[PDB]
Design an enzyme around this catalytic site. Structure first.
Site, PDB file in Angstrom:
ATOM      1  N   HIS A 291     -17.919  50.159   9.010  1.00  0.00           N
ATOM      2  CA  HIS A 291     -17.905  51.096  10.128  1.00  0.00           C
ATOM      3  C   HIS A 291     -17.533  50.449  11.468  1.00  0.00           C
ATOM      4  CE1 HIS A 291     -21.675  49.070  10.538  1.00  0.00           C
ATOM      5  NE2 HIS A 291     -21.900  49.655  11.701  1.00  0.00           N
ATOM      6  N   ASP A 292     -17.390  49.124  11.488  1.00  0.00           N
ATOM      7  CA  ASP A 292     -17.029  48.407  12.716  1.00  0.00           C
ATOM      8  C   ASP A 292     -15.647  47.780  12.612  1.00  0.00           C
ATOM      9  OD1 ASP A 292     -19.672  48.808  13.732  1.00  0.00           O
ATOM     10  OD2 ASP A 292     -20.346  46.979  12.721  1.00  0.00           O
TER      11      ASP A 292
ATOM     12  N   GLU B 186     -26.422  41.333   7.896  1.00  0.00           N
ATOM     13  CA  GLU B 186     -25.158  41.283   8.615  1.00  0.00           C
ATOM     14  C   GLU B 186     -25.294  40.000   9.423  1.00  0.00           C
ATOM     15  OE1 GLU B 186     -24.825  43.815  12.075  1.00  0.00           O
ATOM     16  OE2 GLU B 186     -22.629  43.813  11.886  1.00  0.00           O
TER      17      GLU B 186
ATOM     18  N   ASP C 131     -29.155  44.606  10.106  1.00  0.00           N
ATOM     19  CA  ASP C 131     -28.304  44.529  11.295  1.00  0.00           C
ATOM     20  C   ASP C 131     -28.477  43.209  12.073  1.00  0.00           C
ATOM     21  OD1 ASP C 131     -26.517  46.377  12.993  1.00  0.00           O
ATOM     22  OD2 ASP C 131     -27.996  45.639  14.446  1.00  0.00           O
TER      23      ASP C 131
END
Ligand SMILES: [Ca+2]
Ligand SMILES: [Ca+2]
Ligand SMILES: [Ca+2]
Length: 536
Positions: free
Chosen positions: A312-313, A236, A194
């Site tokens: 998911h974003d 990410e 992340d």
């Protein structure tokens, strides 16, 4: 180029709260995931990127972790997690956990101690100050939150309940490594990191992503944990450029396997403008430049690309760049063909394989995502009507990717038996569902299944180079070459007929959602025509 198991892998991202509910509470859980492993095995994926399932207040639905070593009660327990790893392994599937170490929940024990006893060591696990600068939170407002108990501001680039960890603190970093090794020993297959490019942050100098000590930290992390193992690590990294990705993924640097770059995703909004000011249509010529750049700049041995359309974003690919009407199924296959035949590790987001779309959210109450809710509150007093706001959210809102996975045509698309689901099931589930996709031999599902199998069985997907061919604006064509093999990929990223001014000698068809022979002979492509043929 040393080859690893993941060089032939296709990864499936699961959003735990929306995959499969098995106890009627309207939310997905670990047992739900486990019960669908045969389906994923049938699809052919070699790994699952599991979004956060750790103990969390859910302010950011799992990305605000209160305990890195405990499963959130809502998803089940550690026994369910262990069984998932076991059952998945039995079916050739590895689990990639979501590593969220740039920040923790403000309910994590470290923060509670930091706030309760400002003299404690954990106080330095976070970032505090007396005079806050103008750094802003990605979810709106100041990145500095004033704590009236200790009388200082703590940093948070995300929600107020997501205080940033202090990566300059070598002891904090070690604690992170210990926790990472805790999961490594459980048999995971890797880590999805992340906003990993933010750990080199230097708040006082307004340095966020790509900080001066970023790579040194990654090298340290690697050496202290996953490095000695043969795992897949993908970061990410929103601030990643091809050059920076080379530093991350070139094996000689001992950092990561690959990273997610979001340059193509940037086309979803006007340049230098908020994500909410979205672009209505895909600039195909612009996409061609970006994909070609990443394919060319990251040559074998020098780096490795990750390949994805959505997560998911983000809005589901069909809604933002594909077709959701007359050519839904065909455009879905076209986009699948276009991405998966490039060099790199592709990622399929749950539901993408059956062509799910965004959800027609009616009002703010129906939404759940803090990002959209924060945007709405601010926008409403800054010139934006509620309708204009709801319009932006229906296109870009992260909740569009979080509606329940559509398994069949039963209650709640077979996602749950509860009266209501945490997020509403899209009414199109009557037509768009796994059961219906598996029943139709030529459905979107089988296109992905075939693409996945091609990558697992043919070295050219990895070994071949990439060359963009000159074509019409909306036609995306390229050839992959290696040894005596030449592959031509042609995709009509358009709702209308386009030209194809080429002459080739087709010797073999690897995959096609249309009559590729007709296209070659008539020198024209039907809407969303897509195919890969081996040529002379
Ligand atoms: Ca449940
Ligand atoms: Ca006070
Ligand atoms: Ca019931």
């Amino acid at each position: 180029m040393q080859k690893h198991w993941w060089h032939k892998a296709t990864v499936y991202q699961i959003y735990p709260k929306s995959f499969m509910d098995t106890n009627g509470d309207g939310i997905g859980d670990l047992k739900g995931i486990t019960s669908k492993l045969d389906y994923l095995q049938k699809l052919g994926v070699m790994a699952i990127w599991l979004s956060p399932v750790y103990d969390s207040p859910m302010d950011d639905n799992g990305y605000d972790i209160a305990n890195y070593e405990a499963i959130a009660d809502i998803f089940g327990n550690m026994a369910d997690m262990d069984n998932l790893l076991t059952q998945a392994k039995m079916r050739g599937i590895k689990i990639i956990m979501d590593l969220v170490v740039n920040h923790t929940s403000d309910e994590h024990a470290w923060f509670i101690e930091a706030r309760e006893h400002p003299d404690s060591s954990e106080r330095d696990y976070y970032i505090w100050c007396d005079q806050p600068n103008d750094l802003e939170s990605i979810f709106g407002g100041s990145a500095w939150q004033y704590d009236d108990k200790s009388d200082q501001y703590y940093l948070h680039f995300f929600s107020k309940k997501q205080p940033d960890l202090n990566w300059e603190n070598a002891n904090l970093r070690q604690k992170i490594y210990d926790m990472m090794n805790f999961w490594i020993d459980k048999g995971i297959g890797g880590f999805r990191m992340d906003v990993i490019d933010m750990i080199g942050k230097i708040p006082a100098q307004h340095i966020v992503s790509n900080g001066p000590k970023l790579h040194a930290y990654l090298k340290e992390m690697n050496a202290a944990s996953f490095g000695q193992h043969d795992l897949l690590t993908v970061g990410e990294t929103w601030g990643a450029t091809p050059e920076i990705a080379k530093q991350y993924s070139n094996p000689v640097n001992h950092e990561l396997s690959m990273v997610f770059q979001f340059e193509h995703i940037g086309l979803q909004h006007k340049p230098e403008a908020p994500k909410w000011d979205y672009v209505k249509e895909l600039n195909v010529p612009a996409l061609k430049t970006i994909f070609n750049k990443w394919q060319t700049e990251l040559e074998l041995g020098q780096g490795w690309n990750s390949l994805f359309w959505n997560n998911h974003d983000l809005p589901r690919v069909l809604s933002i760049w594909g077709n959701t009407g007359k050519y839904r199924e065909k455009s879905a296959k076209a986009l699948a063909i276009l991405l998966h035949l490039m060099r790199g590790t592709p990622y399929i987001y749950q539901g993408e394989e059956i062509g799910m779309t965004n959800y027609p959210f009616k009002d703010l109450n129906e939404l759940d995502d803090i990002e959209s809710l924060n945007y709405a509150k601010e926008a409403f007093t800054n010139g934006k009507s509620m309708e204009t706001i709801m319009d932006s959210i229906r296109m870009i809102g992260r909740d569009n990717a979080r509606t329940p996975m559509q398994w069949d045509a039963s209650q709640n698309a077979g996602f749950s038996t509860a009266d209501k689901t945490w997020l509403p099931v899209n009414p199109n589930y009557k037509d768009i569902n796994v059961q219906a996709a598996l029943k139709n031999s030529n459905s979107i599902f089988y296109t992905y299944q075939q693409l996945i199998q091609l990558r697992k069985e043919n070295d050219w997907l990895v070994d071949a180079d990439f060359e963009l061919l000159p074509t019409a604006d909306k036609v995306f064509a390229y050839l992959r070459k290696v040894r005596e093999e030449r592959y031509l990929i042609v995709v009509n990223v358009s709702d209308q007929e386009e030209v194809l001014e080429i002459d080739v000698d087709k010797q073999e068809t690897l995959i096609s959602n249309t009559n590729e022979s007709a296209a070659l002979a008539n020198h024209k492509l039907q809407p969303w025509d897509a195919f890969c043929i081996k040529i002379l």
